[model samples]
Target: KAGPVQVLIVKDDHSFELDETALNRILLSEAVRDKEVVAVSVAGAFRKGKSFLMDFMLRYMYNQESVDWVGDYNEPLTGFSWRGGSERETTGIQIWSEIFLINKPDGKKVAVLLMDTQGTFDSQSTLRDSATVFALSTMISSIQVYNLSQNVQEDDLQHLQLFTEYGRLAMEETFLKPFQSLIFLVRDWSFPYEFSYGADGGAKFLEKRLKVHEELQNVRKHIHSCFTNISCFLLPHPGLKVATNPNFDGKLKEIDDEFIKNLKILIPWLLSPESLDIKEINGNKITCRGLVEYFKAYIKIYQGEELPHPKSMLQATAEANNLAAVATAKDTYNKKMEEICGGDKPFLAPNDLQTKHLQLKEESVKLFRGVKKMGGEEFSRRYLQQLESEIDELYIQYIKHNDS
Candidate 1:
């Protein structure tokens, strides 16, 4: 409960770097293998209570029971390393070390993780630096908690443009949306009486901000296209004690009742069966071990890091996703075909070989289509055509061996 692994590190030259050792140690460990991941990452400007807010989620999930899950009012909260009066307590992106195995609505269980990001637009960080952190968090997270200071600002809406482009650039598949879930967690909400307080109010407010004039209208549509589900939640101040009192212990009772009440509603909703967002690439749901390869690839993506060019990165990721799917399809075909007439197998008659080849080819195509493909059917069709020829060419060689 005390560990928050530093997966992303910022260099002296202002470039964002990924700590591969830290990533592998935590994610690649035996704990997460083969399980689907449900990651929730909170990101916004620094010193804005992003991590402080996440402590409640840690507390909520840690001691989950019908009665008093908040638990031990006297004990200080200590899940994530969030505290007030700081020169930014969070730096780069810090992910909780322990993974929570959550039961989904569909009876399948998944591994849940948390991520706390550094302030995107803080002093000394470049715009590129900010976007890099933002983009990485957006791509990896199942639920991205966009922790805002007050009501959603115009600047805040604009800043999201960076992430939209990544999803937009790699418009690989048609049906499934490009990005994941987004929640606007507005902290220190002063006008709750006017806007009310929970999901209803936040929903109304998000629509209001999303309905700006023409320039942002296009951007609004981009957000609409990119994210699967987008909503907001509001939280009142933690109170004078937790807000300003440096000596205040992070206890549940010291927090404002209203904040606690709202939190009780919020965390469960995020963890609900309906709100389940599994980390997916295209249409394929990624298991924890599967994510390791993607993590390695994303880490390699920033190896030539200069000023951030998000489109290129997204393109690279999309192609990676595409190529990954192709390999999966190819392997499926090869596996089935090898059993029928591979080097160790008995020679098949011509008719049977042709019929079996057709059947397996169709099955491989079906597997490819099941995965999320980039560039729609036209692009996928090219790869499919390539796969078909590779299969046909191999079959011819198999025929030659069978005849001899």
Candidate 2:
């Protein structure tokens, strides 16, 4: 039985399309705006149980009742959230809609979004695809869980190295802050290891590995500077023998006791209101609608032939936002003019034109403020030019109508 909410939002190749109506409906139902959202995402290799881990986390956060299993009885009884199989389960980046509702201690309810991305190193994936996934995960998520099956090997370090380098270069010039936290979840831990060197032991371990690769020393430094906080944890294997016996449901229950115990500690921290990363763009809090646009812009920048750079993308977003604002203002101005002086005739008196022009100019400035700033006066100058051109065109119409 599929849950009331659509857990699978999107699946595509090298592109992402969000179900905006469904997302907004969920937000409206939950009474959550951009300020109340806390995004969490999981990324790792394919067929490594990433979706399973996320399903359990979602269940724990929502107290098990908010979500349900998806497949039919005859089908493998994988849970209702994300399907798990021997083949690749998750494709591209999928964001569940308000999967869990958290009533924080502060008496405010926060909407926790659970995002599961396509696994890295899939046969269908290219180097660019991997970089894009990692970049998007880091950009939008407040908490990024890097899921690993075993110890942090060189390959894992190199993966992180690629993401960090890509992210740093992509967003280096923008005012946007890096992800709030990068948590390393090392599953199937068989070694008798403790955080004797402190909770940063995994980060330290990663650094040690990076030092061995002299070429990546700078990348390691960038990662350290990008994330405000870093931590690591280990989880035991779920002890499922599905390869030998295809009865997955039986083995799923076998690991529930241990899985629940570990989740009790992890999920609460994830749900805490303090962990929310209520980010602002151009000094304005970004709504869910704005987030979708931002994601699209980031993806467009990432998919280009050349390496991604933050300054160009930031400028692009700013320009687009400003132009959009101008378009809206133009519509409003035209409508007001039409109402004042019927549709065909236009001779607004000098006094009327002066008043309207002033009104339109003020309105345009207010609208332009919504554009993301590039920490420069150039954006403002260009926006002013656009506004002036629109007003001039309106004036030209007024004169031509009066002459006719």
Candidate 3:
């Protein structure tokens, strides 16, 4: 019963598009907006069973009746699911509308929002596509799981370096909290490497690799600073070959028990209450009403159509808030005026007009201050001035009407 609802499609050409009807259907559905959201995403090379890993995680997260594979390998596998084969399964970024409830350490339940992305290193995929996907996922998700078949390869490190450089450039002028953690999941692990070292040896191995890499050496500090926490886990081979095994579903039990055990631990860490944080884009905290706009902004930046800057995003958010505040103030003023004037065209006495004007001014000023407070002092002075001028005009119109 638990499955994903497609939210956006990012093509190989670095273009961002969405099916308007499908987007509306998901956004308007009770499943999406019903609970508090905590985002988690998975990214890695194509055909590495990234989607396969997600399917099992989803089954566990949702407490589904049975652990069965999700998605299809049909001709048009457009929506969310893991389709096995040589063909590319996912084309772009997809977010599931259905959220799973997880009880926190404090016993509070939060809805975990799961997202899956197209795999990197595909023939049709460009570096730009990979970078954009990585950047967006880093910005939006609280937990980002980087899946790989075995050890971290050179290509994997290079891709990570590319995205890290992009993030450095994008957020140069603004202060942003990095992703809560970056979990490196090394699948199909079968080696004597861990026998000599401890359980945390996987994480240490990855660290050593990163340290010795010539290209990544310079940015090693920068990359490490990008995440609050970094961890690595080695998953044993899930015995059944998903790609060739016809009875893969029936042999699910053959998968490593150790892998399943570690997965259970990982899920709790992912859904902990402390992991819930407001997603910020271009230094602005995205509000429920502003999420669509944020995505549009990300698309523009990804396509090279616009540069990443905090000012523009902050300005947009302030303007939207200001407009809403103005409307509310006008409504309050109109209702109070109607009560005093009694008739649609009734003229007020001079003293009464003055009293009502002061009342309106007080209410309007309170509204303006509240908006300004939320917008923060960093917001553009020009936008604040514009809102004040609009409010002043409203006040002048009221005075003129009373004089006549």
The numbered model that scores best in TM-score is: 1
Worst 10 residues of 2 by lDDT: 64-73
Q: Which stretches of candidate 3 lie over 4 Å from their true place?
A: 12-14, 24-36, 64-90, 101-103, 106-109, 169-172, 192-199, 243-247, 272-290, 304-404
Residue lDDT tens for model 1, 145-206: 98888778777777788777666765543456777799998888879877867889889878
Q: Candidate 2 — which pairs collide?
A: 68-80, 69-80, 70-80
Candidate 2, 1-404: lDDT as tens digits: 22334322224544444555665565545255433456688888766767667766655554533323211324443445565332444445766655455665676565666777665654545465665566666666767888887776656656666556544643554544445778877776555364322134555654444452355445556776567666676665656553234335553345544544554555555445555554344444444444554555555565444435655555545654455455556656666656656457556566666677678657666666555555357756776687778867886676556453
The weakest ten consecutive residues by lDDT in model 3 span 68-77
> Largest lDDT belongs to which candidate?
1
**Deviation from truth (RMSD, Å), model 2:** 7.7
Backbone clashes in model 1, listed as residue pairs: 46-119, 172-374, 172-375, 283-372
* Residue 54 Cα positional deviation in candidate 1, in Å, after optimal superposition: 1.8
Name the TM-score of candidate 2: 0.67
Off by over 4 Å in 2: 1-35, 64-79, 84-90, 99-109, 122-124, 161-163, 166-176, 194-214, 242-247, 251-253, 256-259, 280-284, 302-372, 380-404
Model 3 / residue 199 / CA error / Å? 7.1
lDDT of each: 0.73, 0.57, 0.56
